[PDB]
Design a protein around this ligand. Structure first.
Ligand SMILES: CC1(C)S[C@@H]2[C@H](NC(=O)CCC[C@H](N)C(=O)O)C(=O)N2[C@H]1C(=O)O
Ligand SMILES: [Fe+3]
Length: 328
């Protein structure tokens, strides 16, 4: 198996005022996006060590009782209002992965989208502060930390496509973003349940099958355990691990916007029997956000694709990914 070319891009100029240096970052983002579709953002300014430690303490100390009380509707029929936010239980002997997903901390009972019961908007559920002291505080702060990194990255993508630097970021707002954080635990198990292992067409043992991301972009931190593969025309290629940088890739909304100029890379997760973390931040816009599709390959920049409001894209995409690859 060959190894993917995933360049490391110093993204620090995107927080600054040196415009020429920003263009030079933009060029690298363009090049990576038209090649394998992945790059590592380095010099990002987020304390990922603290992130890994706090996430570990939570995963390793939450109990079955707390998991039921936090479970999404798929695992607890009482919680019909939790479709996105809450705990995704493992099933001993059958399902290895478990995770905790949370949304915009600004989604409160007094938020207009909650009052209106708009789909994909939910109020986060949290564990008891006395049993997990400082966890909600850390998790909400991390949301805004990685929100800030994603804002800067969206400036890079805009400049890379020949747009003003707020083309995407102007729709990425703290008051209505549907972005989500998912704290995924991949456990070490001995014996490892065979039902939790899928076999690809090419024979590779997998934890999660091929998919495109339902997102504009995805901003991913992972433990230093190699697991990801990206599909190319010549077959799947291994993405090497790096637990100091963020792995960045486009989702299918970007592919729609750019008439597939920046494709949503197809990727899968190899099975690896090792305790590790996968912590994606899915960059989603607002429910009513609409970006006019364009084609950077045509001089006029025009395309025949219909504008697609982000809320409808997200609702349709989340259901489709569950139906294709299963309940996570
Ligand atoms: C490869 C990924 C980063 S992406 C893939 C898969 N992703 C999803 O199911 C999307 C969940 C989105 C979230 N509940 C929401 O409401 O927005 C997952 O988990 N996987 C991760 C992994 O398996 O490590
Ligand atoms: Fe993915």
């Amino acid at each position: 198996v060959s190894k993917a070319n995933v360049p490391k891009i110093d993204v620090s100029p995107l927080f600054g005022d040196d415009q020429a240096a920003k263009m030079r970052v933009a060029q690298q983002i363009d090049a990576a996006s038209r090649d394998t579709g992945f790059f590592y953002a380095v010099n990002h300014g987020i304390n990922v060590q603290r992130l890994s430690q706090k996430t570990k303490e939570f995963h390793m100390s939450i109990t079955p009782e707390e998991k039921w009380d936090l479970a999404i509707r798929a695992y607890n029929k009482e919680h019909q209002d939790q479709v996105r936010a809450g705990y995704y239980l493992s099933i001993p002997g059958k399902k290895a992965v478990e995770s905790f997903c949370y949304l915009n901390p600004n989604f409160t009972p007094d938020h207009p989208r909650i009052q209106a019961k708009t789909p994909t908007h939910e109020v986060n559920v949290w564990p008891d502060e006395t049993k997990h002291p400082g966890f909600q505080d850390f998790a909400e702060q991390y949301y805004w930390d990685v929100f800030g990194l994603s804002s800067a990255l969206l400036k890079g993508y805009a400049l890379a496509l020949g747009k003003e630097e707020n083309f995407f970021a102007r729709h990425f707002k703290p008051d209505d973003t549907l972005a989500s954080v998912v704290l995924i635990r991949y456990p070490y198990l001995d014996p490892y349940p065979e039902a939790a292992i899928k076999t690809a067409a090419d024979g590779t043992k997998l934890s999660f099958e091929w998919h495109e991301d339902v997102s504009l972009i995805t901003v991913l931190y992972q433990s230093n355990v190699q697991n990801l593969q990206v599909e190319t025309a010549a077959g799947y290629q291994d993405i090497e691990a790096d637990d100091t940088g963020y792995l960045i890739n486009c989702g299918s909304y970007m592919a729609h916007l750019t008439n597939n100029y920046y494709k949503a890379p197809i990727h899968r997760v190899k099975w690896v029997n090792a305790e590790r973390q996968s912590l994606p931040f899915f960059v989603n816009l607002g429910y009513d956000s609409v970006i006019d599709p364009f084609d950077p390959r045509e001089p006029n920049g025009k395309s025949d694709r219909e504008p697609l409001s982000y809320g409808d894209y997200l609702q349709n995409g989340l259901v489709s990914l569950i139906n294709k690859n299963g309940q996570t």
